[PDB]
Amino acid sequence: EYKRSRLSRNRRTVNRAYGGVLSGSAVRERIIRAFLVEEQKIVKKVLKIQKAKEK
């Protein structure tokens, strides 16, 4: 009954990233995690450059 020919498009989709697969809360958690984890990698990268030049 979900077949495209038998169901209108608006009833089988959610207008959001990962719509219909992840809830709104789950999408929010992933976005924050992706941003914060990526920021922490930048801090690690910079932190080791200050110690690398120590010589």
Residues that bind RNA (CB under 7 A): 1-5, 8-9, 11-13, 17-21, 23-25, 29-30, 33-34, 36-41, 44, 55
Shortest distance, position 10 Cβ to RNA, whole Å: 9
Residue closer to RNA (CB basis): 49 or 55: 55
Shortest distance, position 12 Cβ to RNA, whole Å: 4
Q: Do 29 and 18 form a contact (C-beta atoms < 8 A)?
A: no
Q: Which residues precede chain breaks (C–N over 2.5 Å) in the chain?
A: none
Q: What is the separation of C-alpha 3 from the centre of its chain, rounded to a whole number of angstroms?
A: 28
